[PDB]
Structure 1
C-alpha cells in the first residue's frame, strides 16, 4: 500500500514504468469455457489447456516481477524497508 512517501519524480518514473515490459487472457477464458461446459471431462484435453496457460503465466509473471523490481530500485533505503514490509502482507 504505497505508504512509501513517493517523490514526485518517483511518481512519474513509476507511471513510465507501467507504460513500458523491459507483450495470446480472452483466448484462454474461451478454452476454459469449453472444458467446463462439455458433457464429459477429457483429462488429456484439459492437460493441453493447462500447458498452454503456463505460457501465458510465464509471460505475465516475468513482466510483473521485472516491473516490481524496477520500482524497488527507484526507492530510497527507508522506502525499500516499507516496500519489503508491505510485501510480507500482500498475497499477490
Structure 2
C-alpha cells in the first residue's frame, strides 16, 4: 500500500517512471474439478503449467516493489514495513 505513505510529488513522478488472469488456466482447473474423480497427476501438471509466466511476473513485481521502497524516506520505510508486518 504505497498510497497511505504521503508520497511527495517527486515520489509520485518516480513511481510513474518505475511502473513504466488467463481463462485457459481456469478451463483446465474446471476440467479437474468437474469430474467424478480427483486426478492428482493431472492436477499437478495443471498447477505447474504456467510456472515460467508466474516467475516472470513475480520477479517484475518484486523488483518494482524494491525500486519503490528505495525512493522512500526512512520515516516512510518504517511505515511501509510496519504495514507489511500487520498484513497477510
Coarse TM-score class (shorter-chain normalised): 0.7 to 0.9
Structure 1 length as normaliser, TM-score?
0.77
Task: Write the deviation string for residues 12-57 of structure 1: whole angstroms up to 9, x where unpaired.
Answer: 22133234xxxxx322112111111123221111111121243343
Distance 2:53 2:32 in 1: 18
Matches of 1:72 and 1:64 in 2, distance apart?
Answer: 12
**TM superposition score normalised by structure 2:** 0.79
Q: Secondary structure at the match of 2:3?
A: coil
Q: Say how many residue pairs are matched.
A: 86
Over 3 Å counting, the alpha-carbon distance change for 1:10 and 1:63 in structure 2 is: same
Q: Unaligned stretches of 5+ in structure 2?
A: none
Name the Cα RMSD after superposition: 1.8
Distance in 2, matches of 1:6 and 1:72, equals 12
Q: Gaps spanning 5+ residues in structure 1: where? A: 20-24
Shift of 1:7: 0.7
